[PDB]
Amino acid sequence: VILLKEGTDSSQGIPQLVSNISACQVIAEAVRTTLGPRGMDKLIVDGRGKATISNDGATILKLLDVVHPAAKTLVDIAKSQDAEVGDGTTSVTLLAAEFLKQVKPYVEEGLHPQIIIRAFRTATQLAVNKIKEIAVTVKKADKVEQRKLLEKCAMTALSSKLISQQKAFFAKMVVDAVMMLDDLLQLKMIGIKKVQGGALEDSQLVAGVAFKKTFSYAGFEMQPKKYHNPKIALLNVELELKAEKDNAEIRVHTVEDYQAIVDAEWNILYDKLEKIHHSGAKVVLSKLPIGDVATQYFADRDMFCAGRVPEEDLKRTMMACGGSIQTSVNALSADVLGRCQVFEETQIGGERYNFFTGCPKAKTCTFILRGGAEQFMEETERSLHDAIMIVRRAIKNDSVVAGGGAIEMELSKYLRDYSRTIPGKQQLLIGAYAKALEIIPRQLCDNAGFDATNILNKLRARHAQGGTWYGVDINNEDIADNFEAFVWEPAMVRINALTAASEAACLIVSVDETIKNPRSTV
Amino acid sequence: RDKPAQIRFSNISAAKAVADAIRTSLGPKGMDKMIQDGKGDVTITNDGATILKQMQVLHPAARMLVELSKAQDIEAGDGTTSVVIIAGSLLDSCTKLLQKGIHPTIISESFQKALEKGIEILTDMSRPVELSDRETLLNSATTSLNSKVVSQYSSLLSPMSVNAVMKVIDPATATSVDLRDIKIVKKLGGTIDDCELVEGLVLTQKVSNSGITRVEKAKIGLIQFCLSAPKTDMDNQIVVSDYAQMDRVLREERAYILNLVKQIKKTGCNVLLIQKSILRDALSDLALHFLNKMKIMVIKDIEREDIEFICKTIGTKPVAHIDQFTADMLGSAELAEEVNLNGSGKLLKITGCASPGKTVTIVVRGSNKLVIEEAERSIHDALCVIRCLVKKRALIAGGGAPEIELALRLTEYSRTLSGMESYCVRAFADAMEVIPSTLAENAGLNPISTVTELRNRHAQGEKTAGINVRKGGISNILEELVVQPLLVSVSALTLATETVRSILKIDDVVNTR
Amino acid sequence: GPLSVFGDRSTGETIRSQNVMAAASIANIVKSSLGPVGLDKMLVDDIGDVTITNDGATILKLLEVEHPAAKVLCELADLQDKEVGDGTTSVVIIAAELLKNADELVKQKIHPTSVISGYRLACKEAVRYINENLIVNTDELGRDCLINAAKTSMSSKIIGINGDFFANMVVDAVLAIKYTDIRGQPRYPVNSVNILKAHGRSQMESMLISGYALNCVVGSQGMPKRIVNAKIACLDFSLQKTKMKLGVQVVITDPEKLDQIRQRESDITKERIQKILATGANVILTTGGIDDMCLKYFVEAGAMAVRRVLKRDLKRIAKASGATILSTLANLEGEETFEAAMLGQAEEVVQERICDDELILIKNTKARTSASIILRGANDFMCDEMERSLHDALCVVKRVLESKSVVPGGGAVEAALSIYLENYATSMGSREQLAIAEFARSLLVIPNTLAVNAAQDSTDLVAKLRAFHNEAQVNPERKNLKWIGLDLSNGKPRDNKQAGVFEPTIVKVKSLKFATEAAITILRIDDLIKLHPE
């Protein structure tokens, strides 16, 4: 009798881990060129035809699926980094991949997971401490320099992303956009309206809040489309002919009672209207639909009404305008009412967007970006989201590190020169770690088709005993202190990178064998 | 009507794509390409004509290019990787002429005049060459080899090629050389180092006796007629009517055979040679027994048309009858020895012949059959290089100089030309920059920088300083010993321009049975 | 537009890696089969032919390979066997790892030309250094260095435990056919010592014959089976019922002759038989058949006659006993006579039974000696294993004796060459210096494979050997360390002379030449077109 159920199998020992390392390299090479200012972009197609185009590595890895364990580990680590930082995901996936590649041949001869895991963990610890100790910072606490370096880090983020002609333009845009936000830094108070047509340069920042005008019945277009200081009431109440609680029943006996009841329903409606009108507000917004009678009344009363508004829209309305959400009208007073100095139903690219500005309070913003492709606008919006993430993390800890591969060569040099005191196979394996730590600038150079060997040689010579912060320019194709080129990115990215890299290395090197069920559950 | 124009555009695009397909195999720094056939073979290849051949494609344009490459190899022989690139580049350039309202007949006439000017452009560019001048021919053939894969032993494959052209024909005057004079053999196994030459020839069959396997100063004999039992060309049967007749038949058969063998032995022969035949062949066991009793070699079953090679090499001449067989007609070679290939067969090399032979043979060995195939094709194309060199004596150095010179001077002609033809001439001028662009590209260079550098160098008017793959840029070529005959370039250009004039005229394709 | 190729083109490093992949897949598959600790690999043919094999070429030859470069490596292994016959497994591994290093290097974006020229020059320098800086003497040995060579041959084989008897046997067998070619140097007729085998009792039950044993037996028990003195008559003429000529027809109107013609059919044969039997013939050897007429006559004479005798063996035995090849009795002219001046010389011939079957055996061909080995084993497969083992050993020893030069091994040559070439490679200081460095590194696989096949701590021993060789080279004051190699008997750095581990220099030279040749061949391959199949 078969010991286990029929259909299973298992690979073991060196062959299993060799296959795993091979899978790691195969999945790694799929994004070999994305990162870098000169990045070259990829596409995917699904069975629904919703083709998606992106150069941010983590999103790319989600766009792809595997069944291999190691590659699944890689893609989930990419998920973790993206949720953690949102930049350099390409860098972390790549780097772990070449560590595993560099260690591959070591399995064929005498070597055990113990020493390699200990070396990986201790090196990761020491290098994270290095990250903390030599991370650059403003250390100035003045808002001018703070804002300047926020924009510099934003363009650093764009120093490997798609757009490169609007770096400072969009950096200042997003920095201001977040500086009209509170200390909560809520991720729901950032309106996004992708607009067809219009140049990429025409993307803008609404100081107040704008949104889309939802469908409305007849009786519109008599309302005044302009006011110079309206007052806003934020509702969540229905202005439509509705039964009381959907279960009410009416039991009368004569036509007079019938007429009294129907006129009474009308009186309820018109009394709510009277409360609203006499309240003094000039506009009303709500999730709930507005009956045509109310719209005709407000047009007759020169007042604007709108319903069926999505919640997040109303949330932004409260958070910026300064009003308060209402489910009831009976206790409407001044403190509940919002207030702004500008209302207008403007036209932005063949659409009808309701614009509310002139609010002295402003704790939320709604981006209005212009372009000609849903996919390219989506990619730009994704990069905007990435920039939001990077600045939101960095705004807490205003300490960063220079991009352009300078810091990676710094840490590689540190590990190398220190990896001459450590003993034995630990020393050799740590040297392999350090050698694997020398690819990302090389990959940037070869992305642009440059002689990366020569570039790395010269920058290593310059890093050895001739100063630090030397990065690789691509428009100049040379080496110099490109830290003063202000390509600076946060260091918690580096720490998280090392954490995930050590995690992955020790995980996959701990792999020894796997049994595969016949997977009848399909 | 437009559909003919769309067909024309489609054909031009197909030709361009086919040409671009082989854009990593040109010149000194080209790269090989696998062609695995549907059959159970495989071919590593670098020569353009070969590559073009193995694609059994169905599109007419590539077939035209294949036949063009065949014609060029017949004319010149080397590196037909370039001509396809030139043809495709001219087609792409004339796409721009077509979109700019230039009638196809007008385009063809523009090509004709461009050909006219370019002939002189190359002609004045070149300089004559000295026959028997070792260095010029050596550099020409070596640079020819540098477009192939066996360049690692060029120091060995050059002297053999040069000695071939000295010892095959006289350097006095021939205007052309018979290639079938030169002979080669390919053998599986051995090494590139084992490759060598002999001024004689080698025979494949091994002597039917092991008693004598290396004879020196032998009087070699060649025989081509039947040796078997007495039998008429026409049918018969010898009827025996008793035991005595049987006895006489046996004794007289023996007597006739030994009489013949004694005739040849009396002629002073040392080594026997028997041709191949069917239908009562020309060898008997009793003959071998007799020859062993008199210490004589024999080789049997040899080819018909090879008689001239053997007779010219050794001096022994064919006889179909014993009566015309004479002792004076013995070819005398110093040494006939059998060699071993370390368990890979036994040959027979004939050396020290006293008769003047005008044919030579060379051997090639290597770790496999494809390496020796590539070396054979390379040596054949080098022999073609030298045949063109002696055909007419004019040279042109490489380094990208010729095409850029022609490009810039056609640019000047366009500057000095008016009418519709001016822009066509400009298009010609811009066309000859593809080859240097490819040479810089596959050399791992930034094409814009180096190509513009050479363009400016030929704007200065100074030359002998062109593309250098050792310096890494534009530098001197005479020290690089990079030279090709003017004839190969002239043939390439003329064949390409005639082909493309045919192309421009042609615009319609129809499918038949 | 789309390429008219109609086939499939793969570009980039993929096919390169695929060649690597090919160079990977087979390599480790045969990895377990060379060195004193190489274990056997079992192969089952599709028709149920299970096989034992340890030498690489025999291992690979029956694999079916469709990947081109892998086929190329296949015939590379086959040639490594057919000329050298030793290192039967090492060469494919060396080439595979060389391809690994090369393809990784090109993946780091270096011009292929620099690395290919590096390959050629490094092959040349390596062969050179092997030639000069490891010269030792074999005249200090002899009749015992051959024993040690046989020991190194059997190291991975099946009889590595009982080498004391077998090595002496094989060296004496070599001495038994030692011939001279150019009258100043020796010569060996390879494949002229028939090794006929039997599913005997044990390896210790095989015996060597100072004579010759056919695959042949006595035609009938009527003949005497032990002739006192051997005057041998070798024949190629077919002794069947004589047929005059294929182009004769009889026409008889006088019937009296008719019956007498029936007589003739015998007479001629019979007559020659008398002639054959006039000279006191002892044994008759013919390729042609022998019928009842000749059988009865030979029984009446008591002289052995064997039909269906092969040809090459007949030539061997005729030369050994001094006999002569005969196809007819005709002399320099029509006189057909038999001469008693060339009869083969031997002591006696017997139809000896070995296990359960008999065979013809020749005793002491006169004026010289001859070699043939009767391989008796527990079964057929392992006996074939000794067959291959001893063939390989004879190839090794004939290479040794042709060129009396040998150096110790077990990684001794490997580590010494690696140390030289790594401490060398400053003659260029350029893009090719790194190439020479990778050559010095890539020879690390031989100690690696030996250690993994022996479960030794590879790094410690390789460091010890490398340090000794490095200090010997850079400091020639104590150059004695250059006479040290690695032995897997106990994982020891030893003077590889007491074990006798010794291999001909030409073997390493030739293997290195073909290895680098194939490596260059592949490194000048970059693109593949898969044409549509027929």
Side-chain angles (χ1 to χ4, degrees), chain B residues 293-317:
Chain B
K293 283 199 287 326
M294 51 205 78
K295 299 289 94 176
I296 306 191
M297 292 180 183
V298 65
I299 283 300
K300 82 175 302 186
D301 289 9
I302 312 301
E303 202 275 333
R304 187 253 180 173
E305 61 86 20
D306 294 338
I307 290 169
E308 198 282 330
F309 294 99
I310 313 153
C311 292
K312 169 168 61 177
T313 312
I314 312 176
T316 308
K317 297 179 177 66

PDB file of all heavy atoms in Angstrom, chain B residues 293-317:
ATOM      1  N   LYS B 293      53.852 -11.550 -53.161  1.00  0.00           N
ATOM      2  CA  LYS B 293      55.025 -12.352 -53.480  1.00  0.00           C
ATOM      3  C   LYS B 293      56.130 -11.522 -54.118  1.00  0.00           C
ATOM      4  O   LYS B 293      57.304 -11.895 -54.018  1.00  0.00           O
ATOM      5  CB  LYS B 293      54.643 -13.519 -54.391  1.00  0.00           C
ATOM      6  CG  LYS B 293      53.965 -14.666 -53.662  1.00  0.00           C
ATOM      7  CD  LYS B 293      54.022 -15.947 -54.475  1.00  0.00           C
ATOM      8  CE  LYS B 293      53.079 -15.876 -55.652  1.00  0.00           C
ATOM      9  NZ  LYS B 293      51.872 -15.097 -55.285  1.00  0.00           N
ATOM     10  N   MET B 294      55.791 -10.409 -54.766  1.00  0.00           N
ATOM     11  CA  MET B 294      56.795  -9.514 -55.326  1.00  0.00           C
ATOM     12  C   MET B 294      56.838  -8.140 -54.662  1.00  0.00           C
ATOM     13  O   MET B 294      57.389  -7.207 -55.255  1.00  0.00           O
ATOM     14  CB  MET B 294      56.591  -9.352 -56.837  1.00  0.00           C
ATOM     15  CG  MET B 294      55.186  -8.986 -57.251  1.00  0.00           C
ATOM     16  SD  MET B 294      54.821  -9.498 -58.943  1.00  0.00           S
ATOM     17  CE  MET B 294      54.527 -11.252 -58.748  1.00  0.00           C
ATOM     18  N   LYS B 295      56.276  -7.990 -53.460  1.00  0.00           N
ATOM     19  CA  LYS B 295      56.419  -6.767 -52.661  1.00  0.00           C
ATOM     20  C   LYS B 295      55.931  -5.530 -53.421  1.00  0.00           C
ATOM     21  O   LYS B 295      56.696  -4.612 -53.722  1.00  0.00           O
ATOM     22  CB  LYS B 295      57.873  -6.578 -52.210  1.00  0.00           C
ATOM     23  CG  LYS B 295      58.477  -7.674 -51.333  1.00  0.00           C
ATOM     24  CD  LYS B 295      57.900  -7.694 -49.920  1.00  0.00           C
ATOM     25  CE  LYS B 295      56.741  -8.655 -49.770  1.00  0.00           C
ATOM     26  NZ  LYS B 295      56.262  -8.740 -48.364  1.00  0.00           N
ATOM     27  N   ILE B 296      54.638  -5.515 -53.728  1.00  0.00           N
ATOM     28  CA  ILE B 296      54.025  -4.432 -54.491  1.00  0.00           C
ATOM     29  C   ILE B 296      52.770  -3.961 -53.769  1.00  0.00           C
ATOM     30  O   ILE B 296      51.962  -4.782 -53.316  1.00  0.00           O
ATOM     31  CB  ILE B 296      53.694  -4.862 -55.928  1.00  0.00           C
ATOM     32  CG1 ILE B 296      54.936  -5.432 -56.614  1.00  0.00           C
ATOM     33  CG2 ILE B 296      53.110  -3.703 -56.721  1.00  0.00           C
ATOM     34  CD1 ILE B 296      54.760  -5.640 -58.092  1.00  0.00           C
ATOM     35  N   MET B 297      52.612  -2.642 -53.660  1.00  0.00           N
ATOM     36  CA  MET B 297      51.376  -2.053 -53.165  1.00  0.00           C
ATOM     37  C   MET B 297      50.313  -2.027 -54.256  1.00  0.00           C
ATOM     38  O   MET B 297      50.596  -2.235 -55.441  1.00  0.00           O
ATOM     39  CB  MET B 297      51.602  -0.624 -52.666  1.00  0.00           C
ATOM     40  CG  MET B 297      52.455  -0.486 -51.421  1.00  0.00           C
ATOM     41  SD  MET B 297      52.645   1.245 -50.951  1.00  0.00           S
ATOM     42  CE  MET B 297      53.738   1.105 -49.548  1.00  0.00           C
ATOM     43  N   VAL B 298      49.070  -1.789 -53.837  1.00  0.00           N
ATOM     44  CA  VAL B 298      47.969  -1.552 -54.761  1.00  0.00           C
ATOM     45  C   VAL B 298      46.933  -0.691 -54.058  1.00  0.00           C
ATOM     46  O   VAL B 298      46.749  -0.766 -52.841  1.00  0.00           O
ATOM     47  CB  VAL B 298      47.337  -2.872 -55.268  1.00  0.00           C
ATOM     48  CG1 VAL B 298      46.684  -3.626 -54.122  1.00  0.00           C
ATOM     49  CG2 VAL B 298      46.338  -2.602 -56.390  1.00  0.00           C
ATOM     50  N   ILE B 299      46.265   0.156 -54.834  1.00  0.00           N
ATOM     51  CA  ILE B 299      45.102   0.901 -54.374  1.00  0.00           C
ATOM     52  C   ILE B 299      44.023   0.778 -55.439  1.00  0.00           C
ATOM     53  O   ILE B 299      44.284   1.002 -56.626  1.00  0.00           O
ATOM     54  CB  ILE B 299      45.435   2.377 -54.090  1.00  0.00           C
ATOM     55  CG1 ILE B 299      46.157   2.496 -52.755  1.00  0.00           C
ATOM     56  CG2 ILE B 299      44.171   3.206 -54.047  1.00  0.00           C
ATOM     57  CD1 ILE B 299      45.346   1.984 -51.603  1.00  0.00           C
ATOM     58  N   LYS B 300      42.814   0.426 -55.015  1.00  0.00           N
ATOM     59  CA  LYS B 300      41.745   0.067 -55.928  1.00  0.00           C
ATOM     60  C   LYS B 300      40.592   1.056 -55.831  1.00  0.00           C
ATOM     61  O   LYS B 300      40.474   1.820 -54.868  1.00  0.00           O
ATOM     62  CB  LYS B 300      41.225  -1.343 -55.636  1.00  0.00           C
ATOM     63  CG  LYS B 300      40.218  -1.397 -54.503  1.00  0.00           C
ATOM     64  CD  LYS B 300      39.650  -2.793 -54.338  1.00  0.00           C
ATOM     65  CE  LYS B 300      38.998  -3.280 -55.618  1.00  0.00           C
ATOM     66  NZ  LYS B 300      38.323  -4.590 -55.420  1.00  0.00           N
ATOM     67  N   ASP B 301      39.738   1.019 -56.854  1.00  0.00           N
ATOM     68  CA  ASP B 301      38.440   1.691 -56.851  1.00  0.00           C
ATOM     69  C   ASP B 301      38.590   3.204 -56.662  1.00  0.00           C
ATOM     70  O   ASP B 301      38.187   3.789 -55.655  1.00  0.00           O
ATOM     71  CB  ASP B 301      37.532   1.071 -55.785  1.00  0.00           C
ATOM     72  CG  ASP B 301      37.079  -0.323 -56.158  1.00  0.00           C
ATOM     73  OD1 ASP B 301      37.607  -0.868 -57.149  1.00  0.00           O
ATOM     74  OD2 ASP B 301      36.203  -0.874 -55.462  1.00  0.00           O
ATOM     75  N   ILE B 302      39.194   3.822 -57.671  1.00  0.00           N
ATOM     76  CA  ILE B 302      39.418   5.259 -57.686  1.00  0.00           C
ATOM     77  C   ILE B 302      38.490   5.897 -58.721  1.00  0.00           C
ATOM     78  O   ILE B 302      38.032   5.254 -59.665  1.00  0.00           O
ATOM     79  CB  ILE B 302      40.896   5.607 -57.953  1.00  0.00           C
ATOM     80  CG1 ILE B 302      41.790   4.758 -57.054  1.00  0.00           C
ATOM     81  CG2 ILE B 302      41.179   7.071 -57.660  1.00  0.00           C
ATOM     82  CD1 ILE B 302      41.500   4.955 -55.581  1.00  0.00           C
ATOM     83  N   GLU B 303      38.224   7.186 -58.531  1.00  0.00           N
ATOM     84  CA  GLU B 303      37.250   7.956 -59.291  1.00  0.00           C
ATOM     85  C   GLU B 303      37.733   8.221 -60.716  1.00  0.00           C
ATOM     86  O   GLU B 303      38.922   8.130 -61.028  1.00  0.00           O
ATOM     87  CB  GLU B 303      36.968   9.274 -58.566  1.00  0.00           C
ATOM     88  CG  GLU B 303      35.653   9.941 -58.909  1.00  0.00           C
ATOM     89  CD  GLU B 303      35.767  10.799 -60.144  1.00  0.00           C
ATOM     90  OE1 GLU B 303      36.887  11.280 -60.414  1.00  0.00           O
ATOM     91  OE2 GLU B 303      34.756  10.972 -60.855  1.00  0.00           O
ATOM     92  N   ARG B 304      36.777   8.558 -61.586  1.00  0.00           N
ATOM     93  CA  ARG B 304      37.066   8.786 -62.998  1.00  0.00           C
ATOM     94  C   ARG B 304      37.701  10.150 -63.243  1.00  0.00           C
ATOM     95  O   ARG B 304      38.814  10.235 -63.767  1.00  0.00           O
ATOM     96  CB  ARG B 304      35.785   8.648 -63.821  1.00  0.00           C
ATOM     97  CG  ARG B 304      36.016   8.714 -65.320  1.00  0.00           C
ATOM     98  CD  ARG B 304      35.536  10.036 -65.904  1.00  0.00           C
ATOM     99  NE  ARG B 304      35.762  10.110 -67.343  1.00  0.00           N
ATOM    100  CZ  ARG B 304      35.316  11.085 -68.123  1.00  0.00           C
ATOM    101  NH1 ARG B 304      34.610  12.092 -67.636  1.00  0.00           N
ATOM    102  NH2 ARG B 304      35.589  11.051 -69.424  1.00  0.00           N
ATOM    103  N   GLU B 305      37.010  11.234 -62.890  1.00  0.00           N
ATOM    104  CA  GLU B 305      37.493  12.552 -63.288  1.00  0.00           C
ATOM    105  C   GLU B 305      38.715  12.999 -62.492  1.00  0.00           C
ATOM    106  O   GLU B 305      39.337  14.005 -62.848  1.00  0.00           O
ATOM    107  CB  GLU B 305      36.373  13.589 -63.176  1.00  0.00           C
ATOM    108  CG  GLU B 305      35.802  13.788 -61.782  1.00  0.00           C
ATOM    109  CD  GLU B 305      36.586  14.781 -60.952  1.00  0.00           C
ATOM    110  OE1 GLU B 305      37.334  15.589 -61.539  1.00  0.00           O
ATOM    111  OE2 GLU B 305      36.448  14.756 -59.712  1.00  0.00           O
ATOM    112  N   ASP B 306      39.084  12.275 -61.434  1.00  0.00           N
ATOM    113  CA  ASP B 306      40.290  12.628 -60.690  1.00  0.00           C
ATOM    114  C   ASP B 306      41.566  12.233 -61.416  1.00  0.00           C
ATOM    115  O   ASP B 306      42.656  12.536 -60.919  1.00  0.00           O
ATOM    116  CB  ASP B 306      40.279  11.978 -59.304  1.00  0.00           C
ATOM    117  CG  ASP B 306      39.183  12.519 -58.415  1.00  0.00           C
ATOM    118  OD1 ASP B 306      38.710  13.642 -58.674  1.00  0.00           O
ATOM    119  OD2 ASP B 306      38.803  11.824 -57.450  1.00  0.00           O
ATOM    120  N   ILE B 307      41.456  11.576 -62.573  1.00  0.00           N
ATOM    121  CA  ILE B 307      42.637  11.078 -63.280  1.00  0.00           C
ATOM    122  C   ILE B 307      43.601  12.217 -63.586  1.00  0.00           C
ATOM    123  O   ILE B 307      44.821  12.071 -63.459  1.00  0.00           O
ATOM    124  CB  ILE B 307      42.225  10.329 -64.560  1.00  0.00           C
ATOM    125  CG1 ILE B 307      41.531   9.012 -64.209  1.00  0.00           C
ATOM    126  CG2 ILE B 307      43.423  10.078 -65.454  1.00  0.00           C
ATOM    127  CD1 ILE B 307      40.873   8.335 -65.391  1.00  0.00           C
ATOM    128  N   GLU B 308      43.070  13.370 -63.996  1.00  0.00           N
ATOM    129  CA  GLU B 308      43.945  14.488 -64.338  1.00  0.00           C
ATOM    130  C   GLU B 308      44.780  14.918 -63.145  1.00  0.00           C
ATOM    131  O   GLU B 308      45.985  15.156 -63.275  1.00  0.00           O
ATOM    132  CB  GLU B 308      43.129  15.671 -64.856  1.00  0.00           C
ATOM    133  CG  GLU B 308      43.957  16.687 -65.636  1.00  0.00           C
ATOM    134  CD  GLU B 308      44.776  17.600 -64.741  1.00  0.00           C
ATOM    135  OE1 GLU B 308      44.345  17.864 -63.599  1.00  0.00           O
ATOM    136  OE2 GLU B 308      45.857  18.046 -65.179  1.00  0.00           O
ATOM    137  N   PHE B 309      44.151  15.031 -61.976  1.00  0.00           N
ATOM    138  CA  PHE B 309      44.861  15.453 -60.778  1.00  0.00           C
ATOM    139  C   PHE B 309      46.038  14.531 -60.516  1.00  0.00           C
ATOM    140  O   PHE B 309      47.183  14.973 -60.366  1.00  0.00           O
ATOM    141  CB  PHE B 309      43.904  15.432 -59.588  1.00  0.00           C
ATOM    142  CG  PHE B 309      42.807  16.443 -59.677  1.00  0.00           C
ATOM    143  CD1 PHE B 309      41.548  16.068 -60.108  1.00  0.00           C
ATOM    144  CD2 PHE B 309      43.028  17.762 -59.335  1.00  0.00           C
ATOM    145  CE1 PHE B 309      40.527  16.988 -60.193  1.00  0.00           C
ATOM    146  CE2 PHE B 309      42.009  18.691 -59.418  1.00  0.00           C
ATOM    147  CZ  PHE B 309      40.757  18.302 -59.849  1.00  0.00           C
ATOM    148  N   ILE B 310      45.758  13.230 -60.500  1.00  0.00           N
ATOM    149  CA  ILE B 310      46.762  12.233 -60.155  1.00  0.00           C
ATOM    150  C   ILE B 310      47.876  12.217 -61.193  1.00  0.00           C
ATOM    151  O   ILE B 310      49.065  12.178 -60.859  1.00  0.00           O
ATOM    152  CB  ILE B 310      46.101  10.852 -60.020  1.00  0.00           C
ATOM    153  CG1 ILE B 310      44.837  10.964 -59.170  1.00  0.00           C
ATOM    154  CG2 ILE B 310      47.065   9.859 -59.415  1.00  0.00           C
ATOM    155  CD1 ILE B 310      43.807   9.910 -59.476  1.00  0.00           C
ATOM    156  N   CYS B 311      47.501  12.230 -62.472  1.00  0.00           N
ATOM    157  CA  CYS B 311      48.483  12.144 -63.544  1.00  0.00           C
ATOM    158  C   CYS B 311      49.387  13.366 -63.553  1.00  0.00           C
ATOM    159  O   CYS B 311      50.606  13.255 -63.719  1.00  0.00           O
ATOM    160  CB  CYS B 311      47.771  11.985 -64.886  1.00  0.00           C
ATOM    161  SG  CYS B 311      46.931  10.405 -65.074  1.00  0.00           S
ATOM    162  N   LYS B 312      48.802  14.551 -63.380  1.00  0.00           N
ATOM    163  CA  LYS B 312      49.601  15.766 -63.345  1.00  0.00           C
ATOM    164  C   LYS B 312      50.505  15.788 -62.121  1.00  0.00           C
ATOM    165  O   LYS B 312      51.653  16.242 -62.195  1.00  0.00           O
ATOM    166  CB  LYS B 312      48.683  16.986 -63.373  1.00  0.00           C
ATOM    167  CG  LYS B 312      49.373  18.297 -63.079  1.00  0.00           C
ATOM    168  CD  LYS B 312      48.466  19.463 -63.421  1.00  0.00           C
ATOM    169  CE  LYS B 312      47.197  19.441 -62.595  1.00  0.00           C
ATOM    170  NZ  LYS B 312      46.339  20.623 -62.886  1.00  0.00           N
ATOM    171  N   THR B 313      50.010  15.286 -60.988  1.00  0.00           N
ATOM    172  CA  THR B 313      50.796  15.315 -59.760  1.00  0.00           C
ATOM    173  C   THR B 313      51.977  14.354 -59.829  1.00  0.00           C
ATOM    174  O   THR B 313      53.113  14.723 -59.513  1.00  0.00           O
ATOM    175  CB  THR B 313      49.904  14.977 -58.569  1.00  0.00           C
ATOM    176  OG1 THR B 313      48.699  15.750 -58.642  1.00  0.00           O
ATOM    177  CG2 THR B 313      50.623  15.282 -57.266  1.00  0.00           C
ATOM    178  N   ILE B 314      51.727  13.115 -60.248  1.00  0.00           N
ATOM    179  CA  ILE B 314      52.729  12.060 -60.158  1.00  0.00           C
ATOM    180  C   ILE B 314      53.473  11.907 -61.476  1.00  0.00           C
ATOM    181  O   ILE B 314      54.690  11.690 -61.493  1.00  0.00           O
ATOM    182  CB  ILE B 314      52.084  10.729 -59.740  1.00  0.00           C
ATOM    183  CG1 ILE B 314      51.171  10.942 -58.535  1.00  0.00           C
ATOM    184  CG2 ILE B 314      53.152   9.696 -59.425  1.00  0.00           C
ATOM    185  CD1 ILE B 314      50.422   9.703 -58.123  1.00  0.00           C
ATOM    186  N   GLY B 315      52.749  12.013 -62.587  1.00  0.00           N
ATOM    187  CA  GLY B 315      53.305  11.801 -63.901  1.00  0.00           C
ATOM    188  C   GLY B 315      52.869  10.515 -64.565  1.00  0.00           C
ATOM    189  O   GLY B 315      52.914  10.424 -65.798  1.00  0.00           O
ATOM    190  N   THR B 316      52.447   9.522 -63.786  1.00  0.00           N
ATOM    191  CA  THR B 316      51.916   8.301 -64.370  1.00  0.00           C
ATOM    192  C   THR B 316      50.654   8.614 -65.159  1.00  0.00           C
ATOM    193  O   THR B 316      49.822   9.420 -64.735  1.00  0.00           O
ATOM    194  CB  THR B 316      51.616   7.270 -63.283  1.00  0.00           C
ATOM    195  OG1 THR B 316      52.769   7.102 -62.451  1.00  0.00           O
ATOM    196  CG2 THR B 316      51.262   5.936 -63.912  1.00  0.00           C
ATOM    197  N   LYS B 317      50.517   7.980 -66.316  1.00  0.00           N
ATOM    198  CA  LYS B 317      49.438   8.320 -67.222  1.00  0.00           C
ATOM    199  C   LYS B 317      48.546   7.106 -67.457  1.00  0.00           C
ATOM    200  O   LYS B 317      49.020   5.967 -67.417  1.00  0.00           O
ATOM    201  CB  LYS B 317      50.009   8.827 -68.551  1.00  0.00           C
ATOM    202  CG  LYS B 317      50.813  10.107 -68.396  1.00  0.00           C
ATOM    203  CD  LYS B 317      51.392  10.582 -69.713  1.00  0.00           C
ATOM    204  CE  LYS B 317      52.132  11.898 -69.537  1.00  0.00           C
ATOM    205  NZ  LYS B 317      53.347  11.736 -68.693  1.00  0.00           N
TER     206      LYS B 317
END
